[model samples]
Target: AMDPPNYDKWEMERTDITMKHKLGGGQYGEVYEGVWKKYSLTVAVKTLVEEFLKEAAVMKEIKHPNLVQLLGVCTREPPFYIITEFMTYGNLLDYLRECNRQEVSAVVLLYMATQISSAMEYLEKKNFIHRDLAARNCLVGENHLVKVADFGLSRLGDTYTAHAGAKFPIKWTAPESLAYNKFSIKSDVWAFGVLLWEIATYGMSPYPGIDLSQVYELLEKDYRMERPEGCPEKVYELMRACWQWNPSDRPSFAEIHQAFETMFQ
Candidate 1:
């Protein structure tokens, strides 16, 4: 073996962490703010459902500033855990909703989107599909930096097998995914568009008056949400690009990142 490797080596002991208060709930329930006693690092630790073990494994392969960093894992026994970087602001949805839009400039919002685009572009290249992509799944870090989280819903490759138990946020999901249960990075881009819309609206729920039952039908008729009150036209236009009916027609995360980059100029 050529120097072996470190990917399969993140096992940690339960005694190594000191549990503090519950940070908040996530898809898997309450995660915690704890200290990794071994490293003296303040970390976000979550009691893992065994399914979340797969999420930890996925996090092992991911390393990006805009993606939550996996600090370590405890898979030596049941009630496993996935430890990650501690985020001060918690989730982006709450951050955006709780803050005054006037206090937060549009530049800051776009900067956050660019950071997310950077993360998704990385996932796109890795052929990782973020079946769940939305403001709620993204966490806010120091200086308002946003990092995508919720990897438990992600799956390797271009498509996922959707069944009766599959949980998807219909408003944030792509039309194709809703209609055919097909998902890919492109489908993720569709959700990214909705995330952009969420940021633009300062975390307003999508499809204001439309019922979840009515969404697919409206989308089938080429319906798209109207631009938010203060959202820039250029950003709104880019959001439209993500809503293209055909998945192939949607902009890749790379292209979305490039667009966001040029918007700052």
Candidate 2:
């Protein structure tokens, strides 16, 4: 394996960290609201299972305005800890739902979309693939800025294959990824389309009536989710492009970002 990025510069002494209440968790581990006493700042502390700790290096090497900033990691560890900038507003999905329809305008949604696309474009340029992409995996910070989070399932390459019987968030995954264990930037684009739907509807669940077990069959019949309530025609068109059956048919992050820029201009 390639040597991991130099994260020594980001290593922190465990004594300066104080864990607060639990924020959330997943198969990998839990995240908590914490404070870096040395810096006198709030932070999000992500505790990782041994296997998922490998993502620390990927997080270390990437830095962008729309990507969550990895502040540092605890030096002494077993159940490792990762410190990142705290997002005051919390998860994008929950934040959207809390806003109510009248609270978020189209321009606001477009701005969030552009930020996500910017971060994904950076990941694409660096050859990193965010296997899971969705509103729930993104954080909403002050001034309505959206930062992509959760690298537990991310891989530092153009493609990745799951070991037999691994679980994934099927609703947010691409058909190809679901059918063949194939994951790549294009698959991430597919998930991004679904994310757009989530934002358009202010956190409505994707495939509302479809059962998880039936999603693959539904996709096999070429069924895609309908246009979200009040979604603009152009935005829906972009989502459709990302859901094209062939992986190569989906737009790259750069192309998608450009389209968003043009649409808002």
Candidate 3:
């Protein structure tokens, strides 16, 4: 594992910055709120934990709006510090938890979906797959915009390597992806389907079944976690489509975004 960078030195170089605990634990390392010349930034410093070097390189090369931007990185240390834009709204799950009430509106859910879909569209264009697509990985910034963060599990669709008993495994993983580490754009689509359910349910846990086998069985049967109450029918239908058993059957993020755009209009 790499050591954390000298934050003291980091704060000195930028006079407009201030550090604050925005959230995240050991895996995400120390994330701080920095102010850059009147512009506030939320930076997540990812250390080079065991087997995390691959993740660090992947994050550095990615540049997209939906994906969190890495402003600075120091890879020499055991746990490296990766500076990025600060998001005030926090993680999507927490944000939904705070607002999951009768007074809450579906517009918020729509906005979140749009942001995620936008990011997915961007990643797909780059031939990248966010294997870990969930509420916890989505960070909120100004104007409540969502940016997909945490690339620990991200891999290129063309160069993905499947691992056994990985660190992170969300219940929403597709049947094929869970069975074989081979992930394609379609597998990502399945994950997004589950993610859509997460957004609609305000971070509710999906698939209360047993182990991976059970989840895989349910998915193979073409069963998916249904949309939460009050979710729009159009969105629900979209989620269903994404969760299709056949990987090739899933909709592209570009098409997904276009659908949402039409729905919003």
Candidate 4:
């Protein structure tokens, strides 16, 4: 019989990766597109502190076509590397805006939502809470495939960034979460509402004219975003369902996934 899968090999050798150019730089460090020897495929190599090893361990066993599967890591040495599949098409936000300049069909937009919803559904089933679920965190791949690609394992709703000094995406956060840092699957559901709006509008930033500092107060008065242009009535309704005031009032990712599946199937 075949031997059990070896988790050890996921600790990639430093020599196997050839770093090329910088992709993006952030508070943690920088990410670069590099070549991985095993698959002969380009991979993204991100350098961060040792905290990344915990993320690597959590990702080793999790795999899905819609989740940016972790390829390997170079944690054994300095300049820690977290390697994952490279999304050549870039992030979903820029992808949407780029296509908006072009002539992307409405069906293709809907397809992207389904792919995202499917990924969220898998995370929901595993009791994972993506504190950060936005188009910027999701990547676009070949044939319009979208994969959830947040580098930090536990972003837990755009959870406050220590490096950034206690700021999060106010427009995409839920009222309860904004009030007391209450993060959960329900909070993520609220963020998904904004994400769906982001998709519908081809990646326009949320709450166009509202100040970020006023979002929580605006939510206190129950000010939700209006429907996006060319968005279906039911799709807008689903977004409202996700933005329900009470976390209990929001639908699960499973229900949201089913909604998307039936939309254009």
- Writing each residue's lDDT as its tens digit, candidate 2 over 78-113 gives 667888999888789889999855557888999999
Q: List clashing residue pairs in candidate 2.
A: none
lDDT of each: 0.83, 0.83, 0.69, 0.81
* TM-score per model over all chains: 0.89, 0.88, 0.78, 0.89
lDDT assessment of candidate 1: 0.83
Candidate 1 C-alpha RMSD relative to the actual structure: 4.6
What is the per-residue lDDT of model 1 for residues 1-265, given as tens digits with 9 covering 90 to 100? 0122453567777788999877764443557889988778899887855467677778889999899899888776777778889888878998999986666788899899999999999999898988788887899877878999884443211123444767567788888888888999989999999999999988888888677778899999999999898888989988999999999999999999999899866
Candidate 4, residue 131: how far the Cα is off, in Å: 0.4
What tens-digit string does per-residue lDDT give for candidate 4 at 1-265? 1223544776767888888887754422478879877669898888864356767777886778999988878776688888888888987887888875445678888888888888889988988888889888898878888898775423323324332355677777788887878899999999988999999998998888776778777887888899998999999999999999999999999999999999969
Stretches > 4 Å off in candidate 2: 1-7, 24-28, 48-50, 151-164
Q: Which of candidates 2 and 4 reaches a greater lDDT?
A: 2
> Where does candidate 3 stray beyond 4 Å?
1-22, 25-27, 30-42, 49-54, 76-79, 100-104, 151-165, 168-170, 209-212
Candidate 2 Cα deviation (angstroms), residue 112: 0.9
Candidate 4: TM-score?
0.89
Cα lDDT for residue 99, candidate 1: 80
lDDT of 3: 0.69
